[PDB]
Amino acid sequence: GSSGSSGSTRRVSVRDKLLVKEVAELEANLPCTCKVHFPDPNKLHCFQLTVTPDEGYYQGGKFQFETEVPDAYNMVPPKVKCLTKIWHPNITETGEICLSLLREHSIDGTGWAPTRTLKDVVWGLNSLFTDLLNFDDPLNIEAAEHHLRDKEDFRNKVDDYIKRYARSGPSSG
């Protein structure tokens, strides 16, 4: 029923089963652009996610993302932070993400819910460099300023920001 105004310390119950079940179908539903890998089974909540878009500016830019699943889950959205450095306006150079679905009770409207899963939360992180790519209220200004002044220089710089601390490997150019 209703629960609040009290400590919440109960060994994982639903989450666990919610992960193993999802995480599984996720590795099967995942597109041919993203790659997930779990270092240790004991801990499912925390895992390593990879996203390498074959289109746009980052046509060949490999990046990693660390997703965290709290106890609330699927009551609450998992905390995801970028590990690699990218000149993306939405994903700061440090490791910050700006996803709506990953917003609690998003006062706006579009936030998280027990309807979606780690499968949908990942699909978006992949579009962050395809469609979602917005240049209005991004996390990093510079990234956006470089696009406003010049759309070419913006994409050109990316190439470097990639090979700098990100490499994919040999591929038909």
Side-chain angles (χ1 to χ4, degrees):
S2 292
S3 207
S5 200
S6 74
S8 63
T9 50
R10 208 282 160 78
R11 55 90 151 187
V12 75
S13 174
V14 301
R15 163 170 87 69
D16 173 79
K17 66 159 173 171
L18 276 174
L19 272 45
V20 46
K21 89 176 273 177
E22 283 163 346
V23 174
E25 89 192 341
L26 155 72
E27 291 192 341
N29 287 295
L30 272 164
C32 289
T33 46
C34 291
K35 190 60 158 196
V36 164
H37 167 280
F38 280 56
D40 287 46
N42 319 282
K43 303 161 80 180
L44 290 177
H45 58 285
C46 67
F47 68 101
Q48 275 86 49
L49 160 68
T50 313
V51 48
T52 311
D54 210 300
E55 60 207 305
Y57 313 112
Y58 312 91
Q59 62 167 50
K62 176 165 271 189
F63 316 114
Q64 278 48 259
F65 293 70
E66 177 89 27
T67 315
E68 193 164 285
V69 194
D71 291 54
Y73 193 86
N74 64 353
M75 301 280 137
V76 305
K79 281 77 76 75
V80 175
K81 75 176 197 273
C82 206
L83 311 171
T84 309
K85 170 203 184 77
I86 321 90
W87 180 254
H88 205 269
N90 209 251
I91 308 150
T92 67
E93 294 73 88
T94 55
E96 270 151 329
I97 319 279
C98 179
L99 210 55
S100 59
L101 90 84
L102 289 167
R103 295 195 90 75
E104 278 185 66
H105 298 285
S106 184
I107 64 87
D108 314 66
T110 50
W112 166 264
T115 64
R116 64 195 62 270
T117 168
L118 210 59
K119 174 180 91 202
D120 297 279
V121 321
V122 161
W123 283 36
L125 293 154
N126 152 60
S127 296
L128 270 180
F129 323 73
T130 75
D131 174 287
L132 316 188
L133 188 44
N134 152 51
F135 282 90
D136 277 62
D137 271 318
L139 271 174
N140 184 25
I141 304 299
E142 291 180 305
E145 291 209 73
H146 209 180
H147 203 228
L148 163 151
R149 60 199 307 287
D150 185 27
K151 164 163 174 190
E152 297 209 317
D153 283 333
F154 165 77
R155 62 165 207 202
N156 295 321
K157 202 78 184 275
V158 177
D159 209 37
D160 206 34
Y161 270 79
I162 295 179
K163 305 162 284 188
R164 279 285 198 168
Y165 318 97
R167 301 270 283 291
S168 65
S171 170
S172 197

PDB file of all heavy atoms in Angstrom, residues 3-24:
ATOM      1  N   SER A   3       3.940   3.478   1.712  1.00  0.00           N
ATOM      2  CA  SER A   3       5.158   3.356   2.503  1.00  0.00           C
ATOM      3  C   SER A   3       5.963   4.652   2.464  1.00  0.00           C
ATOM      4  O   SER A   3       6.315   5.147   1.395  1.00  0.00           O
ATOM      5  CB  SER A   3       6.013   2.198   1.984  1.00  0.00           C
ATOM      6  OG  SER A   3       6.826   1.663   3.015  1.00  0.00           O
ATOM      7  N   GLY A   4       6.250   5.197   3.643  1.00  0.00           N
ATOM      8  CA  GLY A   4       7.011   6.431   3.724  1.00  0.00           C
ATOM      9  C   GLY A   4       7.238   6.880   5.154  1.00  0.00           C
ATOM     10  O   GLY A   4       6.492   6.499   6.057  1.00  0.00           O
ATOM     11  N   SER A   5       8.272   7.689   5.362  1.00  0.00           N
ATOM     12  CA  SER A   5       8.598   8.185   6.693  1.00  0.00           C
ATOM     13  C   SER A   5       9.174   7.072   7.562  1.00  0.00           C
ATOM     14  O   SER A   5       8.763   6.887   8.708  1.00  0.00           O
ATOM     15  CB  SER A   5       7.354   8.776   7.360  1.00  0.00           C
ATOM     16  OG  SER A   5       7.709   9.651   8.416  1.00  0.00           O
ATOM     17  N   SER A   6      10.129   6.331   7.007  1.00  0.00           N
ATOM     18  CA  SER A   6      10.760   5.232   7.729  1.00  0.00           C
ATOM     19  C   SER A   6      11.938   4.670   6.941  1.00  0.00           C
ATOM     20  O   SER A   6      11.940   4.682   5.711  1.00  0.00           O
ATOM     21  CB  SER A   6       9.741   4.124   8.005  1.00  0.00           C
ATOM     22  OG  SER A   6       9.445   3.398   6.824  1.00  0.00           O
ATOM     23  N   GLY A   7      12.942   4.177   7.660  1.00  0.00           N
ATOM     24  CA  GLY A   7      14.114   3.618   7.013  1.00  0.00           C
ATOM     25  C   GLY A   7      13.772   2.462   6.093  1.00  0.00           C
ATOM     26  O   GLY A   7      12.855   1.691   6.370  1.00  0.00           O
ATOM     27  N   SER A   8      14.512   2.343   4.994  1.00  0.00           N
ATOM     28  CA  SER A   8      14.278   1.276   4.028  1.00  0.00           C
ATOM     29  C   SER A   8      15.546   0.456   3.807  1.00  0.00           C
ATOM     30  O   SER A   8      16.373   0.785   2.956  1.00  0.00           O
ATOM     31  CB  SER A   8      13.798   1.861   2.698  1.00  0.00           C
ATOM     32  OG  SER A   8      14.785   2.697   2.122  1.00  0.00           O
ATOM     33  N   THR A   9      15.693  -0.614   4.582  1.00  0.00           N
ATOM     34  CA  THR A   9      16.858  -1.482   4.474  1.00  0.00           C
ATOM     35  C   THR A   9      16.448  -2.946   4.372  1.00  0.00           C
ATOM     36  O   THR A   9      16.444  -3.671   5.367  1.00  0.00           O
ATOM     37  CB  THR A   9      17.802  -1.309   5.680  1.00  0.00           C
ATOM     38  OG1 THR A   9      17.060  -1.408   6.900  1.00  0.00           O
ATOM     39  CG2 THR A   9      18.514   0.034   5.621  1.00  0.00           C
ATOM     40  N   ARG A  10      16.102  -3.375   3.162  1.00  0.00           N
ATOM     41  CA  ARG A  10      15.689  -4.754   2.930  1.00  0.00           C
ATOM     42  C   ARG A  10      16.444  -5.357   1.750  1.00  0.00           C
ATOM     43  O   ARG A  10      16.289  -4.918   0.610  1.00  0.00           O
ATOM     44  CB  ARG A  10      14.181  -4.820   2.672  1.00  0.00           C
ATOM     45  CG  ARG A  10      13.552  -6.142   3.079  1.00  0.00           C
ATOM     46  CD  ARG A  10      13.826  -7.229   2.053  1.00  0.00           C
ATOM     47  NE  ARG A  10      13.646  -8.567   2.612  1.00  0.00           N
ATOM     48  CZ  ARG A  10      12.458  -9.131   2.803  1.00  0.00           C
ATOM     49  NH1 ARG A  10      11.352  -8.475   2.481  1.00  0.00           N
ATOM     50  NH2 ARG A  10      12.376 -10.351   3.316  1.00  0.00           N
ATOM     51  N   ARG A  11      17.262  -6.366   2.032  1.00  0.00           N
ATOM     52  CA  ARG A  11      18.044  -7.028   0.993  1.00  0.00           C
ATOM     53  C   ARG A  11      17.267  -7.086  -0.319  1.00  0.00           C
ATOM     54  O   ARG A  11      16.056  -7.309  -0.326  1.00  0.00           O
ATOM     55  CB  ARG A  11      18.423  -8.442   1.436  1.00  0.00           C
ATOM     56  CG  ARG A  11      17.231  -9.295   1.840  1.00  0.00           C
ATOM     57  CD  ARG A  11      16.669 -10.063   0.653  1.00  0.00           C
ATOM     58  NE  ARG A  11      16.049 -11.321   1.061  1.00  0.00           N
ATOM     59  CZ  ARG A  11      15.603 -12.232   0.203  1.00  0.00           C
ATOM     60  NH1 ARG A  11      15.710 -12.027  -1.102  1.00  0.00           N
ATOM     61  NH2 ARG A  11      15.050 -13.352   0.651  1.00  0.00           N
ATOM     62  N   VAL A  12      17.971  -6.881  -1.427  1.00  0.00           N
ATOM     63  CA  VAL A  12      17.349  -6.910  -2.745  1.00  0.00           C
ATOM     64  C   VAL A  12      16.354  -8.059  -2.858  1.00  0.00           C
ATOM     65  O   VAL A  12      16.616  -9.170  -2.396  1.00  0.00           O
ATOM     66  CB  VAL A  12      18.403  -7.046  -3.860  1.00  0.00           C
ATOM     67  CG1 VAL A  12      18.947  -8.467  -3.909  1.00  0.00           C
ATOM     68  CG2 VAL A  12      17.811  -6.648  -5.204  1.00  0.00           C
ATOM     69  N   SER A  13      15.208  -7.784  -3.475  1.00  0.00           N
ATOM     70  CA  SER A  13      14.170  -8.795  -3.645  1.00  0.00           C
ATOM     71  C   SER A  13      13.642  -8.793  -5.076  1.00  0.00           C
ATOM     72  O   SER A  13      13.949  -9.687  -5.865  1.00  0.00           O
ATOM     73  CB  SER A  13      13.023  -8.547  -2.665  1.00  0.00           C
ATOM     74  OG  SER A  13      11.942  -9.428  -2.914  1.00  0.00           O
ATOM     75  N   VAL A  14      12.843  -7.783  -5.404  1.00  0.00           N
ATOM     76  CA  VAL A  14      12.271  -7.662  -6.740  1.00  0.00           C
ATOM     77  C   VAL A  14      13.329  -7.252  -7.756  1.00  0.00           C
ATOM     78  O   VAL A  14      13.436  -7.845  -8.830  1.00  0.00           O
ATOM     79  CB  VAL A  14      11.122  -6.637  -6.768  1.00  0.00           C
ATOM     80  CG1 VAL A  14      10.024  -7.036  -5.794  1.00  0.00           C
ATOM     81  CG2 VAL A  14      11.645  -5.244  -6.453  1.00  0.00           C
ATOM     82  N   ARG A  15      14.112  -6.235  -7.410  1.00  0.00           N
ATOM     83  CA  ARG A  15      15.162  -5.744  -8.294  1.00  0.00           C
ATOM     84  C   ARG A  15      15.964  -6.903  -8.880  1.00  0.00           C
ATOM     85  O   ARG A  15      16.024  -7.075 -10.098  1.00  0.00           O
ATOM     86  CB  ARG A  15      16.095  -4.797  -7.535  1.00  0.00           C
ATOM     87  CG  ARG A  15      17.425  -4.563  -8.233  1.00  0.00           C
ATOM     88  CD  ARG A  15      18.213  -3.446  -7.568  1.00  0.00           C
ATOM     89  NE  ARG A  15      19.035  -3.938  -6.466  1.00  0.00           N
ATOM     90  CZ  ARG A  15      20.096  -4.720  -6.632  1.00  0.00           C
ATOM     91  NH1 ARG A  15      20.463  -5.096  -7.850  1.00  0.00           N
ATOM     92  NH2 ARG A  15      20.794  -5.127  -5.580  1.00  0.00           N
ATOM     93  N   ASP A  16      16.578  -7.693  -8.006  1.00  0.00           N
ATOM     94  CA  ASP A  16      17.376  -8.835  -8.438  1.00  0.00           C
ATOM     95  C   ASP A  16      16.712  -9.549  -9.611  1.00  0.00           C
ATOM     96  O   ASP A  16      17.249  -9.581 -10.718  1.00  0.00           O
ATOM     97  CB  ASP A  16      17.576  -9.811  -7.278  1.00  0.00           C
ATOM     98  CG  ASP A  16      18.264 -11.091  -7.710  1.00  0.00           C
ATOM     99  OD1 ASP A  16      19.503 -11.076  -7.863  1.00  0.00           O
ATOM    100  OD2 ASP A  16      17.563 -12.108  -7.897  1.00  0.00           O
ATOM    101  N   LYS A  17      15.540 -10.125  -9.360  1.00  0.00           N
ATOM    102  CA  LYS A  17      14.802 -10.839 -10.395  1.00  0.00           C
ATOM    103  C   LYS A  17      14.457  -9.912 -11.556  1.00  0.00           C
ATOM    104  O   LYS A  17      14.381 -10.344 -12.706  1.00  0.00           O
ATOM    105  CB  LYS A  17      13.522 -11.442  -9.812  1.00  0.00           C
ATOM    106  CG  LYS A  17      12.515 -10.402  -9.348  1.00  0.00           C
ATOM    107  CD  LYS A  17      11.115 -10.984  -9.257  1.00  0.00           C
ATOM    108  CE  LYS A  17      10.140  -9.993  -8.640  1.00  0.00           C
ATOM    109  NZ  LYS A  17       8.731 -10.465  -8.741  1.00  0.00           N
ATOM    110  N   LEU A  18      14.249  -8.637 -11.248  1.00  0.00           N
ATOM    111  CA  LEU A  18      13.913  -7.648 -12.266  1.00  0.00           C
ATOM    112  C   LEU A  18      15.095  -7.405 -13.199  1.00  0.00           C
ATOM    113  O   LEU A  18      14.916  -7.081 -14.374  1.00  0.00           O
ATOM    114  CB  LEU A  18      13.489  -6.333 -11.609  1.00  0.00           C
ATOM    115  CG  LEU A  18      12.025  -6.241 -11.177  1.00  0.00           C
ATOM    116  CD1 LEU A  18      11.778  -4.955 -10.403  1.00  0.00           C
ATOM    117  CD2 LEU A  18      11.106  -6.323 -12.387  1.00  0.00           C
ATOM    118  N   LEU A  19      16.303  -7.566 -12.670  1.00  0.00           N
ATOM    119  CA  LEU A  19      17.516  -7.367 -13.456  1.00  0.00           C
ATOM    120  C   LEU A  19      17.823  -8.597 -14.304  1.00  0.00           C
ATOM    121  O   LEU A  19      17.733  -8.556 -15.532  1.00  0.00           O
ATOM    122  CB  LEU A  19      18.698  -7.059 -12.536  1.00  0.00           C
ATOM    123  CG  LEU A  19      18.912  -5.585 -12.188  1.00  0.00           C
ATOM    124  CD1 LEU A  19      17.590  -4.923 -11.836  1.00  0.00           C
ATOM    125  CD2 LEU A  19      19.904  -5.446 -11.043  1.00  0.00           C
ATOM    126  N   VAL A  20      18.185  -9.691 -13.642  1.00  0.00           N
ATOM    127  CA  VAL A  20      18.503 -10.934 -14.335  1.00  0.00           C
ATOM    128  C   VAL A  20      17.535 -11.185 -15.485  1.00  0.00           C
ATOM    129  O   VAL A  20      17.936 -11.615 -16.567  1.00  0.00           O
ATOM    130  CB  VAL A  20      18.465 -12.137 -13.373  1.00  0.00           C
ATOM    131  CG1 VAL A  20      17.218 -12.087 -12.504  1.00  0.00           C
ATOM    132  CG2 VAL A  20      18.530 -13.442 -14.152  1.00  0.00           C
ATOM    133  N   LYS A  21      16.257 -10.913 -15.245  1.00  0.00           N
ATOM    134  CA  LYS A  21      15.229 -11.107 -16.261  1.00  0.00           C
ATOM    135  C   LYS A  21      15.389 -10.101 -17.396  1.00  0.00           C
ATOM    136  O   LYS A  21      15.396 -10.471 -18.569  1.00  0.00           O
ATOM    137  CB  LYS A  21      13.837 -10.975 -15.639  1.00  0.00           C
ATOM    138  CG  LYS A  21      13.299  -9.555 -15.650  1.00  0.00           C
ATOM    139  CD  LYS A  21      11.875  -9.494 -15.122  1.00  0.00           C
ATOM    140  CE  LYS A  21      10.860  -9.749 -16.225  1.00  0.00           C
ATOM    141  NZ  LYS A  21       9.466  -9.770 -15.703  1.00  0.00           N
ATOM    142  N   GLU A  22      15.518  -8.827 -17.037  1.00  0.00           N
ATOM    143  CA  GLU A  22      15.678  -7.768 -18.027  1.00  0.00           C
ATOM    144  C   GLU A  22      17.058  -7.832 -18.674  1.00  0.00           C
ATOM    145  O   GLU A  22      17.183  -8.061 -19.877  1.00  0.00           O
ATOM    146  CB  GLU A  22      15.470  -6.398 -17.379  1.00  0.00           C
ATOM    147  CG  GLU A  22      14.010  -6.057 -17.132  1.00  0.00           C
ATOM    148  CD  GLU A  22      13.835  -4.921 -16.143  1.00  0.00           C
ATOM    149  OE1 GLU A  22      14.822  -4.573 -15.460  1.00  0.00           O
ATOM    150  OE2 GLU A  22      12.713  -4.381 -16.051  1.00  0.00           O
ATOM    151  N   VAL A  23      18.095  -7.629 -17.866  1.00  0.00           N
ATOM    152  CA  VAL A  23      19.467  -7.664 -18.357  1.00  0.00           C
ATOM    153  C   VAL A  23      19.633  -8.717 -19.448  1.00  0.00           C
ATOM    154  O   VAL A  23      20.335  -8.497 -20.434  1.00  0.00           O
ATOM    155  CB  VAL A  23      20.463  -7.958 -17.220  1.00  0.00           C
ATOM    156  CG1 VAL A  23      21.868  -8.143 -17.776  1.00  0.00           C
ATOM    157  CG2 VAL A  23      20.434  -6.843 -16.185  1.00  0.00           C
ATOM    158  N   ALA A  24      18.980  -9.860 -19.264  1.00  0.00           N
ATOM    159  CA  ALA A  24      19.054 -10.946 -20.234  1.00  0.00           C
ATOM    160  C   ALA A  24      18.447 -10.531 -21.569  1.00  0.00           C
ATOM    161  O   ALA A  24      19.149 -10.438 -22.576  1.00  0.00           O
ATOM    162  CB  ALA A  24      18.350 -12.183 -19.695  1.00  0.00           C
TER     163      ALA A  24
END
